[PDB]
Amino acid sequence: TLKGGA
Amino acid sequence: RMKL
Amino acid sequence: GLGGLERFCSPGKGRGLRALQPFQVGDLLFSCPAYAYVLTVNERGNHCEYCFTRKEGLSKCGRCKQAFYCNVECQKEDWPMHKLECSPMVVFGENWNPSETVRLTARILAKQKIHPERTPSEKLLAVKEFESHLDKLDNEKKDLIQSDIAALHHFYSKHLEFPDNDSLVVLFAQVNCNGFTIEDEELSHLGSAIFPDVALMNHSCCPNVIVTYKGTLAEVRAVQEIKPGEEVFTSYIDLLYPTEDRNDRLRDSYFFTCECQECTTKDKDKAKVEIRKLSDPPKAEAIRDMVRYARNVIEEFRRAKHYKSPSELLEICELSQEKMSSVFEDSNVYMLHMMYQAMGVCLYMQDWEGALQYGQKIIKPYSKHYPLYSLNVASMWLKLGRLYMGLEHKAAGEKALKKAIAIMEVAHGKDHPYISEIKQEIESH
Ligand SMILES: Nc1ncnc2c1ncn2[C@@H]1O[C@H](CSCC[C@H](N)C(=O)O)[C@@H](O)[C@H]1O
Ligand SMILES: [Zn+2]
Ligand SMILES: [Zn+2]
Ligand SMILES: [Zn+2]
């Protein structure tokens, strides 16, 4: 689980 | 979420 | 499936999502309930485990005293997932420390046991159909998954029945490839989740949609005009950094090299790594030397953040900025990185003056480096506004809060609870 901003 |  | 949208074969990108009707800036393309989700440990007591609502006076689970809820309904609805951890948390005590990825994967396995059939989260893409990139994983990534499998066995043996080792490797790889992080309005980490239909969208560094969250429900809204036939693209990563940094992360985590317009042209690279106009211009070797240094202190700080004291962490930020400033301008993204980290430390220390000074230096470079409707920009305006209000700078607070609202109305929708909350803060101080 990594998808995202900052 | 800052504790302010 | 999802009206106005279709799954298709995007050449060179596997499967993708394509628009069948036009969408204007701010339009909701679709929403997607979480297939599985977990609240991060540090946010327990502030948020309800089931629905992620932030409020004071949450009901505490009488057994483990480490999961909080809006009421008994939220508590009862969360029980099928919470029982994976409730008793183990007390029995293992201080030794209970599964990583968040393990916690999420455990809940995936539990969901599959209860609800084996296709869920409303999987209208266009099912969890079983997730990309794994198993054949591209190197030994270090495989050995880390095998470590996660050992943790899954160690902490969840009594509640879960495991598939064979091969299936667990694939599942963990699918999670690494398709899982999402949930953040609050200040981009603070709230938890991790699986959103199958949202996972279908491919990546662009100039995306035409942004994903936001209404509790545990993912929402997808246009930030550029989308025409019929055009592919729907979200961003997987922080877009602050130059092209080689973005593509280093995308290759490492998702096993592809991006070819969007930003990566192809590299038009923003030079502004992102801006160099001071000194009497004697710094040579290319000196620039590459400082970039290497910057990347090293960024890594050193990421490690130090686990054990060093707040004042020691500020020292690292201060010293690194001093050294970089001999070559880098303040708007340089490596300077902005350490400034943001320093701001984070100040916010945790409740040093509002310190955090405000860093925010004021960050916001204008953020506005030009990030895209037009960036959540990174909105949340920085929001942090500034809350700092201003807290320090009784009412006029500057109102200005900053309104700047945040103007962006969030597009990304979050005009009716989002976050926007209602922020308007109260304008008319409270
Ligand atoms: N811009 C891009 N160029 C090439 N591949 C991409 C891409 N964006 C996403 N992908 C692919 O999509 C994966 C993320 S999951 C997105 C859906 C995927 N295309 C699928 O068929 O299931 C990445 O690991 C990569 O393989
Ligand atoms: Zn709740
Ligand atoms: Zn409990
Ligand atoms: Zn790109």
For residue C418, the domain's CATH number is 1.25.40.10
Q: What was the experiment behind these coordinates?
A: X-ray
Joined tokens for residue C333: 């993204």
Length of chain A: 6
- Resolution in Å, one decimal place: 2.1
The boundaries of the domain holding residue C166 are 43-178
Domain end among C203, C237, C271: C237
Domain end among C237, C253, C273: C237
How many Cβ atoms are within 10 Å of C117's Cβ, its own excluded? 5
**C1 is annotated as contributing to ligand binding:** no
How many Å apart are CA C208 and CA C411, to the nearest integer?
Answer: 11
How many Å apart are CA C286 and CA C278, to the nearest integer?
Answer: 13
Q: Which residue has 């009716």 as its token pair? A: C415
Question: Domain holding C209: CATH number?
Answer: 2.170.270.10
Q: Which residue has 């961003």 as its token pair? A: C235
- Residues C412, C325 share a domain: yes
What angle do the packed helices C394-412 and C417-426 form, to 10 degrees? 170
Of C187, C389, C341, C357, whose CA–CA distance to B1 is shortest? C187
- Residues C218, C86 share a domain: no
* N-to-C CA span, chain C: 46
**For residue C298, is it left (φ>0), alpha (ψ between -120 and 50) or beta?**
alpha
- Residues C216, C87 share a domain: no
What angle do the packed helices C310-325 and C284-304 form, to 10 degrees? 180
**For residue C187, is it left (φ>0), alpha (ψ between -120 and 50) or beta?**
left
At position C218, the amino acid (one-letter code) is A
How many Å apart are CA C239 and CA C206, to the nearest integer?
Answer: 9
- Residues C277, C386 share a domain: yes
Joined tokens for residue C357: 């000074």
Q: Which residue has 């095998």 as its token pair? A: C146
- Residues C307, C191 share a domain: no
Chain A residues with CB under 8 Å of C178 CB are 3
Q: C48: Cβ–Cβ under 8 A, 6 or more apart, which residues?
A: C55, C58, C68, C69, C70, C74
Burial class (CB in 10 A: 0-12, 13-18, 19+), C95: exposed
At position C88, the amino acid (one-letter code) is P
Q: Number of helices (H) and strands (E) in chain B: give both, helices first.
A: 0, 0
C46 SS3 class: coil
How many Å apart are CA C364 and CA C267, to the nearest integer?
Answer: 19
CB C227 within 8 A of CB C67: no
- Residues C185, C250 share a domain: no
Which ligand is closest to the CA of C67, given by its number? 3
Q: Which residue has 């995306």 as its token pair? A: C207
What angle do the packed helices C375-390 and C394-412 form, to 10 degrees? 150
Ligand 1 binding pocket includes C255 (Cβ within 6 Å) = yes
- Residues C402, C373 share a domain: yes
User: Phi and psi at residue C256, in whole multiples of 5°?
Assistant: -150, 160
CB contact under 8 A, A1 and C238: no
C356 SS3 class: helix
How many Cβ atoms are within 10 Å of C239's Cβ, its own excluded? 20
- Residues C313, C416 share a domain: yes
Determine which of C108, C127, C171, C192 to mutate to test the interface with A (most A C-beta atoms within 10 Å). C192
Of C13, C412, C411, C2, whose CA–CA distance to C197 is shortest? C2
**DSSP conformational letter for A3:** B
Residue C74 belongs to what H/E stretch? helix C72-82
Q: How far is CA C234 from CA A3, C135, C254, in A?
A: 10, 25, 14
- Residues C311, C202 share a domain: no
Length of chain B: 4
**C13 is annotated as contributing to ligand binding:** yes
Q: Point out which residues pair with C6 in neighbouring strands.
A: C18
Joined tokens for residue C203: 């990546």
Burial class (CB in 10 A: 0-12, 13-18, 19+), C25: middle
How many Cβ atoms are within 10 Å of C252's Cβ, its own excluded? 9
**For residue C116, is it left (φ>0), alpha (ψ between -120 and 50) or beta?**
alpha
The count of domains in chain C is 3
- Residues C412, C281 share a domain: yes
- Residues C185, C169 share a domain: no
- Residues C186, C170 share a domain: no
How many Å apart are CA C120 and CA C217, to the nearest integer?
Answer: 12
